From Swiss-Prot, chain A:
UniProt function note: Binds to the LIM domain of a wide variety of LIM domain-containing transcription factors. May regulate the transcriptional activity of LIM-containing proteins by determining specific partner interactions. Plays a role in the development of interneurons and motor neurons in cooperation with LHX3 and ISL1. Acts synergistically with LHX1/LIM1 in axis formation and activation of gene expression. Acts with LMO2 in the regulation of red blood cell development, maintaining erythroid precursors in an immature state.
Residue range from the parent sequence: 64 to 282 of 411
Phosphoserine modifications at: 202
Keyword list, A-Z: Acetylation, Developmental protein, Nucleus, Phosphoprotein, Ubl conjugation
Keyword Ubl conjugation: yes
Source organism of the structure: Homo sapiens (Human)
Locations listed in the record: Nucleus
Domain of life: Eukaryota
Tissues showing expression: Expressed in a wide range of adult tissues including brain, heart, skeletal muscle, colon, thymus, spleen, kidney, liver, small intestine, lung and peripheral blood leukocytes.
Protein name per the record: LIM domain-binding protein 1
Sample GO molecular function, one term: LIM domain binding
GO terms, biological process: anterior/posterior axis specification; cell adhesion; cellular component assembly; cerebellar Purkinje cell differentiation; epithelial structure maintenance; gastrulation with mouth forming second; hair follicle development; negative regulation of DNA-templated transcription
Subunit structure: Interacts with ESR1. Forms homodimers and heterodimers. Interacts with and activates LHX1/LIM1. Interacts with the LIM domains of ISL1 and LMO2. Can assemble in a complex with LMO2 and TAL1/SCL but does not interact with TAL1/SCL directly. Strongly interacts with the LIM2 domain of LMX1A and more weakly with the LIM1 domain. Homodimerization is not required for, and does not effect, LMX1A-binding. Component of a nuclear TAL-1 complex composed at least of CBFA2T3, LDB1, TAL1 and TCF3. Interacts with LHX6 and LHX9.
UniProtKB/Swiss-Prot annotation, chain B:
Name this protein carries in UniProt: Single-stranded DNA-binding protein 2
Annotated localization: Nucleus
Residue span(s) of domain LisH: 9-41
Domain of life: Eukaryota
Species the sequence originates in: Homo sapiens
Tissue: Ubiquitous.
Whole sequence portion shown: 10 to 94 of 361
Curated annotation (Swiss-Prot), chain C:
TM stretches of this protein: none
Subcellular location: Nucleus
Residue numbers of the full-length protein present here: 11 to 77 of 361
Limits of the LisH domain: 8-40
Chain's gene name: SSBP2
Annotated protein name in UniProt: Single-stranded DNA-binding protein 2
Source organism of this protein record: Homo sapiens
UniProt tissue specificity: Ubiquitous.
Tree of life domain: Eukaryota
Amino acid sequence: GNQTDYRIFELNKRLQNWTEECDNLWWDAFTTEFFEDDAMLTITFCLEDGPKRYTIGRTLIPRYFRSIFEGGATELYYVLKHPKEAFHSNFVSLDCDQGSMVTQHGKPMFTQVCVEGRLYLEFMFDDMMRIKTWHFSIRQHRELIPRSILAMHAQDPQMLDQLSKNITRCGLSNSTLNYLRLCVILEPMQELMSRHKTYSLSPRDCLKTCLFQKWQRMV
Amino acid sequence: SAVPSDSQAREKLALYVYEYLLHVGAQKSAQTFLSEIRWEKNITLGEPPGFLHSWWCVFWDLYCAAPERRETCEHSSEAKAFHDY
Amino acid sequence: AVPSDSQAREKLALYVYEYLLHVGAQKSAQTFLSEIRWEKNITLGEPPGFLHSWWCVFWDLYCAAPE
């Protein structure tokens, strides 16, 4: 898969440059290198009550990557085993049923959470082969704890069955869960904001006039 | 222009919380805040309740949209309409 | 007078108190609660608070929103 595999390689390679000092401008430069200006990201899982699906546009994408780190990750990379490449008129699909999102957690309790699932990517077929669409349907997940730290807290039972617990609910830390939940609702408001930025009105009156409008789009 | 830095966002949040404290009736806390963070730039503010209050309240309204909580917590109707339709 | 305001305001007040506590303005926080006359309990959060994480998303959106 000589053209697109390499793009996922470069994505991982850059994610090796992350530091704790990486802010909004750094994540924006990263996203701009790997994502088209109108790209769309999607996570999907099952959690504890039923299937869940979160889709965010381009500007909300950097903080998505940042969310994984700010929940305890110190490095991140994707492993795609046997992805299926397909070339089309104007884009290239990469469809990997055996996709793995791996994150290492820092000091203390140097744990590794490996999230398994289906990664579907659509790249544009141009010189800067950037991602148009990113879709991650999460199935299972694992949390692995160093056999070093098992020996450490091995004779501290009340504390140590604490380490039979789980850091993440679905492979996603609470950071990302809460971020994507907030995105669900703030992202459609962006049009109201534009209304606000242009016509001078109250945010509630913006909401009103937009809602007011959108029945007629339908006719 | 461009993308807000973390500094710029923290500054905008600080000033808009100052305006919030003013319109909520927290003058003492407003100026105690202004120098507990060493603010030095000329302020100008808009009508009550202010930027943060208005936007936050329509956010929390849209919070009770059709997905998840919906009709479990009090909510508007125009918000649920903005979501479903 | 929408029926979600009566707790939208309360949640904003609590998240602002938490914001002030975590940003380093202790006296601002205490004065805010006496000026809001709160006698509900006060349960901490993990820094930074909810108002901060919400504002980051909101402001990235607001700036990105076009005319």
